[PDB]
Ligand SMILES: Cc1cc2nc3c(=O)[nH]c(=O)nc-3n(C[C@H](O)[C@H](O)[C@H](O)COP(=O)(O)OP(=O)(O)OC[C@H]3O[C@@H](n4cnc5c(N)ncnc54)[C@H](O)[C@@H]3O)c2cc1C
Ligand SMILES: Cc1cc2nc3c(=O)[nH]c(=O)nc-3n(C[C@H](O)[C@H](O)[C@H](O)COP(=O)(O)OP(=O)(O)OC[C@H]3O[C@@H](n4cnc5c(N)ncnc54)[C@H](O)[C@@H]3O)c2cc1C
């Protein structure tokens with residue numbers, strides 16, 4: 001029951017799922033004069049995921065790297081509606097999306113209707129076009145215990161969750177005497193995943209331990225040991241070999257114990273079972289005790305997308321995400337598009353890919369606006385002659401700790417960059433600032449780095 | 464059981480209760496070469512209470528107006544120990560203080576002992592001298608419902624508690640249609656107390672509603688009504704009549720409904736019963752519906768101080784706080800001192816008073832260091848010839864909203880200030896910045912005000 005369906009306007013109802021890179025990048029460029037836009041997301045803010053590994057340790061504040069959805073929609077002149085809720089079912093036959101956990105509805109540039117909704121009431125939202133940018137969710141690979149005893153580094157609440165844990169262990173351990181093995185354990189951190197998230201997380205945590213904790217509890221700081229665990233034989237594989245080594249070396253120089261070729265078989269409350277494959281093909285078992293565990297491995301399709309696989313014939317055998325056209329249309333659907341991590345275009349799950357995908361689609365959308373037939377769709381795209389989506393790989397950036405980073409900057413075939421150390425760390429800084437989506441988020445981080453230069457980090461367990 | 468008592472050193476063990484204005488101002492000036500200092504407080508940070516009314520609405524961030532205790536103790540060269548716990552009993556006969564809810568113990572500039580304490584374990588902390596600066600706690604006057612349905616503006620968790628409430632009501636109300644009286648109620652705020660805390664709280668809340676909420680939900684913003692309730696016939700009575708009127712007028716011009724001569728008799732979930740005395744001496748009853756209620760009235764002695772009243776003969780009949788000498792020594796005690804709100808010197812309960820009291824005592828303490836007899840105390844003070852505490856009233860400052868404030872600046876008999884509007888608002892700004900206790904807290908707020916000038920306030924219900 002309960003169906004929301006506004007259509008007094010002679011504009012198509014475009015409906016966006018998500019408030020991330022895809023969803024927001026799309027919103028930034030969509031023509032609200034030609035279309036009526038509605039957004040559904042449980043998160044009322046955009047999250048600049050690349051600096052999320054700085055939040056917990058407090059290099060940057062959780063508020064500095066987020067921006068309200070409504071601040072974006074305010075720059076769009078036309079009608080924007082934001083439902084603060086989560087999409088539970090996509091219904092292609094009815095062209096609605098069932099939502100759940102409705103917190104709020106904001107109607108911007110709309111001095112008009114009242115939907116008659118109540119909080120936490122279920123409702124179907126009709127759409128003429130659907131853009132699905134709900135992102136992926138963290139994958140535990142069915143490795144038992146991960147969720148029970150570990151923390152993802154994925155959203156903002158995760159950042160607080162980590163600080164509270166580490167804070168609590170610092171407090172508990174410092175009461176125990178130096179000898180106690182429990183004290184050594186509680187001061188142990190284990191970051192699973194040698195992908196940039198994990199590398200940056202391990203590095204940031206270290207910077208704090210070296211630069212801040214040491215300033216007033218050096219007896220503790222010395223006993224803290226940070227482990228990084230990677231199943232592959234190399235860290236940051238998306239970079240050149242030359243840089244993946246320098247990263248690994250530098251991490252080790254900052255006192256991080258890098259466990260290469262090591263796969264976590266199980267996670268217990270106070271330790272995790274690791275298997276390691278060696279050069280000679282032998283498998284050895286290790287036990288790594290831990291106080292804090294950060295799980296920064298790969299991601300996985302959300303149940304809403306899994307749900308949808310079964311409802312469309314030619315998605316039945318999809319797994320990673322929605323199989324999608326060269327025009328980023330969900331195969332088997334006449335009016336649904338998918339961008340970013342919930343889509344499958346055999347491209348890397350990266351904000352870079354989501355950003356481009358979004359822009360391409362938005363431009364296609366105002367192109368559709370000037371064609372009678374859109375006012376069955378599969379064919380019109382090729383018929384009316386506009387390009388398929390071609391991804392342009394711009395490169396990669398990763399902070400390694402101790403004011404060092406690696407970089408590669410390309411466009412197409414040419415590669416032009418500096419990927420060393422201290423120089424690259426500044427580049428990394430600048431480049432990140434620049435590719436932030438808002439002046440506010442930009443100014444906040446600029447100030448956060450200046451205060452860092454003079455006073456180095458806030459670590460409040462209740463804030 | 465369990466008594467902590469370090470005394471290998473030939474220095475007296477000075478023990479401080481609290482991490483506020485008294486406790487910290489005292490710490491800033493106490494001579495740690497002559498004395499071994501220990502602090503007990505459940506709060507691990509200093510709170511700049513004058514800007515606490517800016518936190519909830521997000522003019523300033525909760526982190527910008529707080530500073531860790533250990534940051535202060537780090538500037539003190541000698542031994543400082545911080546117990547993160549609350550004092551539950553003061554024991555004059557034993558010269559110990561029983562503590563409870565022990566979270567952590569930090570020993571700074573002490574490469575030495577291990578106390579053998581565990582978390583949430585009870586323990587008595589011995590002292591040679593005790594300074595009690597635990598402050599007061601909010602007074603509901605036994606008016607039923609206040610705690611059940613209302614929020615104090617006292618500590619940092621209060622600021623989050625208020626934002627969450629207001630945020631929740633904004634979300635709920637916006638779903639209801641304009642007509643609905645529930646919508647009007649949920650958008651209703653009631654700030655009890657015409658003291659500067661309430662005035663500033665009501666004003667800040669207003670600035671947000673006018674300057675921010677209006678930018679994206681003007682239909683809501685218009686329906687929000689802020690009430691201010693004061694039992695006396697005037698607001699901000701500590702100021703001259705001329706200024707108390709201008710304040711009241713300006714508040715009314717910013718659309719705040721000021722209920723003068725109005726005392727809250729009872730608080731229900733959705734409304735509160737008010738009685739109002741009129742010019743002609745008639746009592747009329749009012750019902751003020753509310754969604755959010757902020758209780759910013761007077762304060763009250765904590766149970767730890769109440770507990771102590773009974774243990775000392777000449778404190779038996781104390782009520783507001785500990786009766787105290789002209790040397791700020793607790794009457795009836797030979798080694799206990801009390802400063803700030805938990806003390807009673809017939810002076811106003813203000814950070815200004817607590818700041819001076821603390822300095823005076825610290826200076827007295829290094830004076831005691833050079834006299835054999837301190838290495839029974841009541842007499843020595845007058846005998847060894849140093850001044851009693853004389854309070855110097857420096858004046859008063861209060862922000863009124865809409866970038867206006869009132870000010871009075873004096874020292875002794877002479878009064879020299881500008882107390883008008885926009886001018887005074889800047890003065891207010893400068894003067895507050897200057898009387899912050901740390902460069903970090905100072906820089907943070909300076910940046911918070913600049914970001915305000917360009918982007919106006921973060922209002923995140925989960926942060
Ligand atoms: C810690 C970290 C660091 C990273 N650093 C980098 C980097 O430096 N460079 C880089 O290129 N990439 C980086 N990434 C990857 C990048 O963040 C992702 O590729 C990107 O988020 C994908 O964009 P998206 O819009 O598909 O999903 P997201 O950006 O995650 O957004 C998905 C949105 O969907 C919402 N949502 C979830 N479920 C529902 C539902 N049922 N209904 C409605 N909405 C829903 C979410 O709240 C979210 O707003 C990083 C990722 C992480 C976790
Ligand atoms: C919102 C607000 C705004 C204010 N604005 C102003 C202003 O503009 N100007 C002004 O002059 N005054 C102002 N005040 C008043 C001023 O803050 C107090 O008079 C001053 O804080 C008193 O200092 P204190 O050390 O006595 O107590 P506080 O500064 O309150 O500090 C008390 C300390 O004791 C700790 N504590 C509590 N219980 C225990 C226990 N059992 N054991 C150990 N520690 C304990 C607390 O955590 C805290 O660290 C304001 C107060 C509030 C609430």
Ligand SMILES: NC(=O)c1ccc[n+]([C@@H]2O[C@H](COP(=O)([O-])OP(=O)(O)OC[C@H]3O[C@@H](n4cnc5c(N)ncnc54)[C@H](O)[C@@H]3O)[C@@H](O)[C@H]2O)c1
Nearest residue numbers: 193194195196197230231232263264296297298395396397
């Ligand atoms: N182009 C850019 O601007 C840019 C920059 C930085 C990062 N990124 C992207 O950000 C994304 C962040 O993802 P990520 O950092 O989690 O990398 P990832 O999730 O792709 O890699 C996770 C790693 O964990 C390892 N792993 C899996 N299971 C394991 C187990 N049981 N035990 C131990 N290790 C295990 C895997 O071998 C893998 O290398 C990446 O996809 C990356 O491409 C993009």
Ligand SMILES: NC(=O)c1ccc[n+]([C@@H]2O[C@H](COP(=O)([O-])OP(=O)(O)OC[C@H]3O[C@@H](n4cnc5c(N)ncnc54)[C@H](O)[C@@H]3O)[C@@H](O)[C@H]2O)c1
Nearest residue numbers: 656657658659660692693694695726727760761858859860
């Ligand atoms: N010198 C400075 O720099 C400076 C500046 C501002 C404030 N201050 C001090 O800080 C404090 C700020 O205010 P506060 O939080 O202490 O409040 P307060 O204790 O100053 O006053 C509380 C107010 O609430 C009223 N009230 C009491 N019961 C009531 C009821 N049932 N219904 C309605 N109203 C009721 C009282 O009449 C009183 O006006 C003051 O004590 C002030 O002296 C100092």
